[PDB]
Amino acid sequence: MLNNLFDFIEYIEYWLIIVAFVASVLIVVAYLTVAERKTMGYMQRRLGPNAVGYYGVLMAVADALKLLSKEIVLPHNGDIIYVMSGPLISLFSVLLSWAVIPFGPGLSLLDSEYSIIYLLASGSIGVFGTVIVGWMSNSKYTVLATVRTTAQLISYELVLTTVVFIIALIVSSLNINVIIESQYNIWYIIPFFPLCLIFFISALAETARPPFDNVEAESELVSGHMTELSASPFVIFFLSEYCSMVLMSTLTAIFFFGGYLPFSNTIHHLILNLFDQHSIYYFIIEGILLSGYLAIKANFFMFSFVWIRAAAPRLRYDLLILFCWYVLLPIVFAIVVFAPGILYCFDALPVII
Amino acid sequence: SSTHTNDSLNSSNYVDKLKDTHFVFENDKLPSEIPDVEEVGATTAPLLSAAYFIGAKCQDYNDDFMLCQKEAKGNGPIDCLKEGRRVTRCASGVLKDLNTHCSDEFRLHWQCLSFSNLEYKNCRKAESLLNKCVFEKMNLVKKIPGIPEDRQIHLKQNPVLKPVALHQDSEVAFKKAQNENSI
Amino acid sequence: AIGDYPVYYKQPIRWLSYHAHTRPHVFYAIAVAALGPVFMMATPLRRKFLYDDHEPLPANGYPLPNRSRDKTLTGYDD
Amino acid sequence: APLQQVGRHGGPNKCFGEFQRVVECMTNAKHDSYEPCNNLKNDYLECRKHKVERYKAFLMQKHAEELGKDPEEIGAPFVRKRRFLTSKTLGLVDGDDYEIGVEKI
Amino acid sequence: MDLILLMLVAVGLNIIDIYIMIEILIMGCTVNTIYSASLDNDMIGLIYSLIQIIIAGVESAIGLSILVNYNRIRNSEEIE
Amino acid sequence: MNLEILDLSILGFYSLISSNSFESIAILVATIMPVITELWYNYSQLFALLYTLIYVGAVVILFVFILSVINEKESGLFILILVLLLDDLDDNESNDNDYNNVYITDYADWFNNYNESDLSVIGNLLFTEYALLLLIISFILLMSIIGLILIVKKD
Amino acid sequence: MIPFEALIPYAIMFAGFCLGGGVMNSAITADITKRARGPNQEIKRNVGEDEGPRNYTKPRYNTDQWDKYFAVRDLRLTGSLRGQSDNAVAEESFKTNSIQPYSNTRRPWVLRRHIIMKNSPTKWARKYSSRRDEREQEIKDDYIRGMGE
Amino acid sequence: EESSESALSKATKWYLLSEIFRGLYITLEMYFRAPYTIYYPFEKGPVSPRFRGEH
Ligand SMILES: CCCCCCCCCCCCCCCCCC(=O)OC[C@H](COP(=O)(O)OCCN)OC(=O)CCCCCCCCCCCCCCCCC
Ligand SMILES: CCCCCCCCCCCC(=O)OC[C@H](COP(=O)(O)OCC[N+](C)(C)C)OC(=O)CCCCCCCCCCC
Numbered sequence A: 001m002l003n004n005l006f007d008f009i010e011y012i013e014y015w016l017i018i019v020a021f022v023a024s025v026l027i028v029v030a031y032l033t034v035a036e037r038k039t040m041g042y043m044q045r046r047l048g049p050n051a052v053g054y055y056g057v058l059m060a061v062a063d064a065l066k067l068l069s070k071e072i073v074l075p076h077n078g079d080i081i082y083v084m085s086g087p088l089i090s091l092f093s094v095l096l097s098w099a100v101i102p103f104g105p106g107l108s109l110l111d112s113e114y115s116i117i118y119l120l121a122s123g124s125i126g127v128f129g130t131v132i133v134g135w136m137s138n139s140k141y142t143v144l145a146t147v148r149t150t151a152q153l154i155s156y157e158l159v160l161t162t163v164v165f166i167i168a169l170i171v172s173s174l175n176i177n178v179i180i181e182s183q184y185n186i187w188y189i190i191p192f193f194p195l196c197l198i199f200f201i202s203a204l205a206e207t208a209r210p211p212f213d214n215v216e217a218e219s220e221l222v223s224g225h226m227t228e229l230s231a232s233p234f235v236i237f238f239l240s241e242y243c244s245m246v247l248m249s250t251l252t253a254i255f256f257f258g259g260y261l262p263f264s265n266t267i268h269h270l271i272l273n274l275f276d277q278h279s280i281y282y283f284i285i286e287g288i289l290l291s292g293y294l295a296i297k298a299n300f301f302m303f304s305f306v307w308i309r310a311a312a313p314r315l316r317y318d319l320l321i322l323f324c325w326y327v328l329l330p331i332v333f334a335i336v337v338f339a340p341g342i343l344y345c346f347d348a349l350p351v352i353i
Numbered sequence B: 001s002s003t004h005t006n007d008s009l010n011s012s013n014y015v016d017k018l019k020d021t022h023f024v025f026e027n028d029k030l031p032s033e034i035p036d037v038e039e040v041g042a043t044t045a046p047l048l049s050a051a052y053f054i055g056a057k058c059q060d061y062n063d064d065f066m067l068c069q070k071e072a073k074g075n076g077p078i079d080c081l082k083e084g085r086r087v088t089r090c091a092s093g094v095l096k097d098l099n100t101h102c103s104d105e106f107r108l109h110w111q112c113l114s115f116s117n118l119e120y121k122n123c124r125k126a127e128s129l130l131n132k133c134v135f136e137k138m139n140l141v142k143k144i145p146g147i148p149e150d151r152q153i154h155l156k157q158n159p160v161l162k163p164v165a166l167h168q169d170s171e172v173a174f175k176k177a178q179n180e181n182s183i
Numbered sequence C: 001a002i003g004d005y006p007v008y009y010k011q012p013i014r015w016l017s018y019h020a021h022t023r024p025h026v027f028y029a030i031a032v033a034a035l036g037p038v039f040m041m042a043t044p045l046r047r048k049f050l051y052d053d054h055e056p057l058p059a060n061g062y063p064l065p066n067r068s069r070d071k072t073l074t075g076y077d078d
Numbered sequence D: 001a002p003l004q005q006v007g008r009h010g011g012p013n014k015c016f017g018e019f020q021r022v023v024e025c026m027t028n029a030k031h032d033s034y035e036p037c038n039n040l041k042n043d044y045l046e047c048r049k050h051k052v053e054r055y056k057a058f059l060m061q062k063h064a065e066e067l068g069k070d071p072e073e074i075g076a077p078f079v080r081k082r083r084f085l086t087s088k089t090l091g092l093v094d095g096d097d098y099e100i101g102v103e104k105i
Numbered sequence E: 001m002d003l004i005l006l007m008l009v010a011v012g013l014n015i016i017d018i019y020i021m022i023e024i025l026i027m028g029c030t031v032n033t034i035y036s037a038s039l040d041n042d043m044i045g046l047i048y049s050l051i052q053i054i055i056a057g058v059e060s061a062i063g064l065s066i067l068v069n070y071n072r073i074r075n076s077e078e079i080e
Numbered sequence F: 001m002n003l004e005i006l007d008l009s010i011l012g013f014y015s016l017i018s019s020n021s022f023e024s025i026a027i028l029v030a031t032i033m034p035v036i037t038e039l040w041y042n043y044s045q046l047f048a049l050l051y052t053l054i055y056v057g058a059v060v061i062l063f064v065f066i067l068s069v070i071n072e073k074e075s076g077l078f079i080l081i082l083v084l085l086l087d088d089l090d091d092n093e094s095n096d097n098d099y100n101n102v103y104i105t106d107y108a109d110w111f112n113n114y115n116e117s118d119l120s121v122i123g124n125l126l127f128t129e130y131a132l133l134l135l136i137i138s139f140i141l142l143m144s145i146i147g148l149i150l151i152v153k154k155d
Numbered sequence G: 001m002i003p004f005e006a007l008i009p010y011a012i013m014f015a016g017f018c019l020g021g022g023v024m025n026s027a028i029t030a031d032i033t034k035r036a037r038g039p040n041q042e043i044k045r046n047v048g049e050d051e052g053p054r055n056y057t058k059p060r061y062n063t064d065q066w067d068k069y070f071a072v073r074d075l076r077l078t079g080s081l082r083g084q085s086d087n088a089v090a091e092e093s094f095k096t097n098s099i100q101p102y103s104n105t106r107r108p109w110v111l112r113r114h115i116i117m118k119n120s121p122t123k124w125a126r127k128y129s130s131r132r133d134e135r136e137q138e139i140k141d142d143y144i145r146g147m148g149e
Numbered sequence H: 001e002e003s004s005e006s007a008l009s010k011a012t013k014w015y016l017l018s019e020i021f022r023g024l025y026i027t028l029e030m031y032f033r034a035p036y037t038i039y040y041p042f043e044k045g046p047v048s049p050r051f052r053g054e055h
């Protein structure tokens, strides 16, 4: 057979694309954990993991497989609901939030003019997943990291939501693809540099990364909510924190560094002229290039997640809630009344072309 | 705008299951009392490519077709059936001309539109060749009403927003005209 | 008054300096925010010196000619 | 007067015309009473819910049942799965019956 | 079935459970408005729904604030 | 197999048996999710996302925030299934039979060449036509900020 | 002194994005193009000898309501939602294949099955009071009562 | 009133995180330095003749 097998592929083709998409995200997340220790290792004059697989390539494999084969500790044998439900919400939200990220023009699973709302809505479901982990527990350390966890995520959600809305206001579109294409002539890091610092600061808090680390602070509250997590509930929750790191690093690339747009249009043009547009080999190269530009921009921020962790001491929680309210929020509302003013003054109010 | 409606195809088959949508056909053709017209067969991309030449050639009939809708006072579909066939015949006239005068210039342009998300900003090199050809062989021009001639967008020599990726057939055809024509 | 808190209606200039040193989180958020409405007020200056406003978009449906239907319209008939 | 029944694109929607004709009659000055506008009020309600027209569909369904008329031969052909709007069904000359692509536009 | 007031069996025995029932009750009103507005292709109904969601949020915040101060009022010895 | 029915039957089963406040807050989340999902498909995708952003992201995590503050302390299978089955039988919210059994369509038209999202029109009317409704809302929000602080703040 | 062992994970994360993007750009483009070649499977797969170079169609984004009307209009002409055709005259099957979807207008399931959301002063009168429905049924009855005149 | 820095200088350092960006830069200098790690058990740390071990 050859004719009754081709249509089989055409009936399964769009499932292979999704698996290639999910594998694409998980490979980045899996090797983000290694890159965090490999990078933070070399800034501390260490080496980091280089013994598990040649040069430590199989380090995420060992850590995941080690925990996937640990004894799950349930309060009573049939309490799998309590342990898993917390991390499961967190993992689904951040895996569903990947559905709007485009790897090129139009290459996103969900394309709709409400992509920005879908992205902020999905993240807020993950916030609900985080606080549930401790709220079903009697351990004092685990239940400690709910009231402080709840407000930290609540407080820096306003700042992250408003920043996204200012960029959406400059293009007058809540579509991810339109925002990226709107940055052809200029990258929004040049006009809105302060928002990028505010976006990156807020992004750290939302993922509970240091220096906004007070939730899962080893010296303060041990593993935080994870001091009661082991085996699979630990990995799923740990994976969620690194899906968010990859996502929020990609989102900073999209909103301020042009997304998949090339660093040089000339180099992009010269490279693609070596392939014929009438053969599928041209489109693989463009897709590799366009995701390559995003990957390099995204990698720089996954680097900065680790880089700031190796350079800044952890910030005290009481001084952390007052930072986003008494410093960041007035600035963010000041700009949201500033950008419409400048645009109107020069008759440059945006329209979705 | 991707809002769900009761009038066309929706986003997903899960919308159809909730609405219990039936996609209903009607075999009955039009009665013989209404003289037949040959419907336009062009798809989306060719129409967007020839839209400004349909506007230049069928301007009187399009205005008259609409003025019949304005003055029909709600009975527009029934009382403008004869004036609605002139527009269909006029537009078929233009697409038939482009196929018999500028077949390669036309096809190159709407292949570019099918390659660049159906956006006019991405296909200026192919579009400029098509406009120049149409002018000499049919006298049609592209004009955007409401602005001075010097400030039309498609004549902008250095546009701010440019295509990310080039159309190979457009760039190859353009430089050939830089030798054939720019003598 | 080497360090006294200024009174706004007697020392307007020094009152802002006190807040531009001790409350940078308030003074410059107000300064940034006011730069928006200030720029809106300077819009008439730009009209007379830089360029006119663009022509408004044709976002009101099909442009209907303001006249009566043509009577001699022929061609493309059945 | 305030805008009511605004479409999803900023213009008048399906039933705005009927509602406007009601307001013209009710606020008119040549009417002694509201009797002449009673039919226009029904049309605006009809345009929105089609209750009278759905009722007419119920009798034509019920009348055919009492006469034995075959539903497949009096009704109109329909397709429930959008993937099976095949070119054979659409009537295209050399159309297969293989399903169509409704994955990504 | 609900004419025997079954929904009273479905509301818990804490003041916070009443607050939730008020939200679930109002949620039904907004869903009804979104349903009508989309069928009619009327955005005025969608303006109403947006107001209902925003007003239903302010009602929650005030109710919780009263409940929070109600709770600390008992636990107000604070003589340590 | 309209599976949206089975989600609510499970939901209607746990609403009759919830004891503590953990399950009571669970009924809230278990009700919005069918509301959001049944709005995402069918009727309005815009208001499915507005609900997630405003209800789940804003008012739901406030409940669990104060439950940890308030306290955490402290039927028969025949009657429940009997009640749920009785609740299950009659689910016709309206008694216009033709309105519930006869389907309708709309006809599209090309007269709207300026196509923009619903949120474009809603903003177009809320910031122009009903600017009083918008301004009162910011006034209701203002009173809450004052109202929260006077109720809760100690000194 | 650049550490290459430290940058190995990044070169693998760079390949992760490229793997997903390279597949999506090419697979979706190939599928869109293939279905835009003709109305049957024996046309889509094979390439004719007298056919010229293949012009791929890139996936479309940022659409509006006209693109939902254009998509169905293209479907009725070529059998694909993104077919290509520039014939000045359509097939004679174009005049008898308009798809008009008919769907119900019933309230959401949650609005009429939730143990709490369905309870309301007016929702009981819709469900258990005949006052509204008897009044409206008069108008339906008087439709057929007026065909005699 | 006796602070030598002007208001803008004190606020530019505050809003633009002057010392933090320096702190990052010093940490990034170490990234291009030779690490200290030795690959035991293929290498051993220094020992001296006075060392006390097994009897
Ligand atoms: C991705 C799946 C996520 C959900 C995983 C859990 C699924 C288990 C079924 C619960 C969800 C069904 C929805 C109705 C809520 C019912 C909540 C409840 O009554 O308690 C359930 C849970 C287990 O306790 P149980 O033994 O069932 O009841 C007696 C305990 N004294 O009591 C507990 O509180 C234990 C911890 C459960 C916390 C779940 C939080 C609420 C659910 C939110 C996530 C799912 C959202 C709803 C989606 C489905 C909606 C129908
Ligand atoms: C340009 C884009 C990259 C940098 C973005 C951030 C700028 C930070 C400095 C402005 C704030 C400020 O307050 O600047 C002024 C400050 C402090 O000056 P001072 O202590 O009074 O100097 C003393 C007296 N002098 C002026 C005679 C010397 O200078 C700095 O600490 C400079 C820090 C430079 C290293 C950090 C940059 C590299 C980070 C990573 C880049 C990839």
Ligand SMILES: CCCCCCCCCCCC(=O)OC[C@H](COP(=O)(O)OCC[N+](C)(C)C)OC(=O)CCCCCCCCCCC
Residues within 6 Å of the ligand: A194, A195, A197, A198, A200, A201, A211, A304, A308, A312, A319, A323, A327, A331, C022, C024, C025, C028, C032, H014, H015, H016, H017, H020
């Ligand atoms: C107008 C231009 C707008 C620019 C917008 C940018 C503002 C950013 C914040 C500045 C205010 C500030 O750093 O504040 C410091 C605050 C609160 O300090 P405080 O309690 O008020 O005491 C100090 C002030 N005193 C004495 C005047 C009262 O806490 C912090 O240490 C927050 C440090 C966060 C660092 C996170 C890592 C950075 C990652 C990104 C780079 C890799």
